Amino acid sequence: YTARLQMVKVLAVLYDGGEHAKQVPGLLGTTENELGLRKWLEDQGHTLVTTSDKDREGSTFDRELEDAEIIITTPFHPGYLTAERLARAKKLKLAVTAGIGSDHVDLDAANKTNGGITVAEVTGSCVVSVAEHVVMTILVLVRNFVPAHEQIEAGRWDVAEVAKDEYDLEGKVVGTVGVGRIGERVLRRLKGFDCKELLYYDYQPLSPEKEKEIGCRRVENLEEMLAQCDVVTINCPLHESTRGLFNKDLISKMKRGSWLVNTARGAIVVKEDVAEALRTGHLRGYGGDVWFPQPAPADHVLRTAKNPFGGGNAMVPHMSGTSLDAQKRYAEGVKRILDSYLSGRFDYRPEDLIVHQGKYATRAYGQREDVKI
Amino acid sequence: TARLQMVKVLAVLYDGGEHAKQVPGLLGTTENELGLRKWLEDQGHTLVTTSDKDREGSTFDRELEDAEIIITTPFHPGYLTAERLARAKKLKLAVTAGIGSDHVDLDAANKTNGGITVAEVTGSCVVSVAEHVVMTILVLVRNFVPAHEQIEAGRWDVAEVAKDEYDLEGKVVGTVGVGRIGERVLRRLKGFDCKELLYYDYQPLSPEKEKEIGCRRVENLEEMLAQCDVVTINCPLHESTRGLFNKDLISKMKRGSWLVNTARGAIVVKEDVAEALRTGHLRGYGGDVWFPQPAPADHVLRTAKNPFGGGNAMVPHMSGTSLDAQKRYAEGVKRILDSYLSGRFDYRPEDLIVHQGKYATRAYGQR
Ligand SMILES: NC(=O)C1=CN([C@@H]2O[C@H](COP(=O)(O)OP(=O)(O)OC[C@H]3O[C@@H](n4cnc5c(N)ncnc54)[C@H](O)[C@@H]3O)[C@@H](O)[C@H]2O)C=CC1
Ligand SMILES: NC(=O)C1=CN([C@@H]2O[C@H](COP(=O)(O)OP(=O)(O)OC[C@H]3O[C@@H](n4cnc5c(N)ncnc54)[C@H](O)[C@@H]3O)[C@@H](O)[C@H]2O)C=CC1
**Ranges of H-type helices in chain B:** 19-22, 37-41, 59-63, 82-87, 106-110, 126-141, 144-152, 158-162, 180-189, 207-213, 221-227, 247-250, 270-279, 323-341
CATH topology identical between A9-123+322-360 and A127-317: yes
The terminus-to-terminus CA distance of chain A in angstroms comes to: 26
Which are the contacts of A94, defined by CB distance < 8 A and separation ≥ 6?
Answer: A69, A70, A71, A117, A118, A120, A337, A338, A341
CA atoms within 13 A on the CB side of A256: 3
Ligand 1: centre distance to CA B147 (Å): 23
Asked if A193 lies within 8 A of B188 by C-beta distance, the reply is yes
**Ranges of H-type helices in A43-126:** 60-64, 83-88, 107-111
Q: Is A180 in the pocket of ligand 1 (CB under 6 A)?
A: yes
What is the residue with the minimal CA distance to atom 23 of ligand 1? A178
Q: Which ligand is nearest to the CA of B77?
A: 2
CA-CA distance, B361 to B358, in Å (whole number)? Answer: 9
Residue of B154, B302, B322 lying closest to A163 (CB–CB):
B322
- Mode of pairing for the β-strands spanning B215-217 and B196-200: parallel
Evaluate the CA torsion angle A76, A77, A80, A85 in order and state its sign. negative
Q: Is A314 in the pocket of ligand 1 (CB under 6 A)?
A: no
> What DSSP line would sit under A332-345, residue for residue?
HHHHHHHHHHHTS-
Q: Is B28 in the pocket of ligand 2 (CB under 6 A)?
A: no
Which are the contacts of A194, defined by CB distance < 8 A and separation ≥ 6?
Answer: A170, A171, B127
Q: Is B180 in the pocket of ligand 2 (CB under 6 A)?
A: yes
Query: Shortest CA distance to A239 belongs to which of A369, A120, A365?
Result: A365
On chain A, the residues whose CB falls within 8 A of the CB of B143 are 319
CA-CA distance, B327 to B35, in Å (whole number)? Answer: 10
- Mode of pairing for the β-strands spanning B358-359 and B352-355: antiparallel
Which helix (H) or strand (E) covers residue B96, if one does? Answer: strand B93-96
Under 8 Å between Cβ of B9 and B69 = yes
Residue type, B218: V
CA-CA distance, A73 to A58, in Å (whole number)? Answer: 18
Whole-angstrom CA distances from B224 to A328, A354, B175, B198 are 28, 45, 9, 7
Whole-angstrom CA distances from B199 to A142, B175, B178, B233 are 28, 5, 6, 10
Residue of A nearest to B295 (CA): A157
Q: Ligand 2 pocket test: which of B102, B178, B181 has the largest number of ligand atoms within 8 Å of its C-beta?
A: B181
Asked if A159 lies within 8 A of B316 by C-beta distance, the reply is yes
CA-CA distance, B365 to A259, in Å (whole number)? Answer: 41
Under 8 Å between Cβ of B159 and A321 = no
Nearest 5°: the CA angle B279, B284, B290 is 105
DSSP character for A5? P
CA-CA distance, A2 to A60, in Å (whole number)? Answer: 34
Locate the ligand 2 atom nearest the alpha carbon of residue B200 and give its number.
31
Which are the contacts of B29, defined by CB distance < 8 A and separation ≥ 6?
Answer: A160, B13, B14, B15, B16, B19, B20
What's the count of helices (H) and strands (E) in chain B, helices before strands?
14, 14
CA-CA distance, A336 to B260, in Å (whole number)? Answer: 39
Strand B215-217: give its sheet, edge to edge: B215-217, B196-200, B172-176, B230-233, B257-261, B282-287, B312-314
**Ranges of H-type helices in chain A:** 20-23, 38-42, 60-64, 83-88, 107-111, 127-142, 145-153, 159-163, 181-190, 208-214, 222-228, 248-251, 271-279, 324-342
Neighbours of A140 (CB within 10 A): 28
For chain B, the domains span 8-122+321-359, 126-316
After which residues does chain B have a break in its backbone, defined as C to next N over 2.5 Å? Answer: none
On chain B, the residues whose CB falls within 8 A of the CB of A136 are 135, 138-139, 142, 144
CA-CA distance, B46 to B42, in Å (whole number)? Answer: 10
Q: Give the method used.
A: X-ray
Residue A139 sits at φ, ψ, to 5 deg, of: -65, -50
Task: Return the CATH superfamily for domain B8-122+321-359.
Answer: NAD(P)-binding Rossmann-like Domain (3.40.50.720)
Q: Which ligand is nearest to the CA of A177?
A: 1
Whole-angstrom CA distances from A228 to A167, A174, A222, A225, A231 are 17, 9, 10, 5, 9
CATH topology of domain A127-317: Rossmann fold (3.40.50)
- Helix A127-142 to helix B126-141 angle, to the nearest 10 degrees? 130
Under 8 Å between Cβ of A263 and A133 = yes
Neighbours of A369 (CB within 10 A): 5
CA-CA distance, A71 to B191, in Å (whole number)? Answer: 36
Strand A283-288: give its sheet, edge to edge: A217-218, A197-201, A173-177, A231-234, A258-262, A283-288, A313-315
Instruction: Label each residue of A300-312 as H, E or C.
Output: CHHHCCCCCCCCC
CA-CA distance, A130 to A217, in Å (whole number)? Answer: 22
Experimental structure resolution, Å: 1.1
Residue B172 sits at φ, ψ, to 5 deg, of: -95, 120
Residue type, B202: Y
Q: Which CATH architecture has domain B126-316?
A: 3-Layer(aba) Sandwich (3.40)
Evaluate the CA torsion angle B232, B237, B241, B242 in order and state its sign. positive
On chain A, the residues whose CB falls within 8 A of the CB of B51 are none
For A9-123+322-360, the fitting CATH number among 3.30.420.340, 3.40.50.720, 3.90.930.60, 3.30.70.260 is 3.40.50.720
Percent of chain A as helix, strand, coil, to the nearest 5: 35, 15, 50
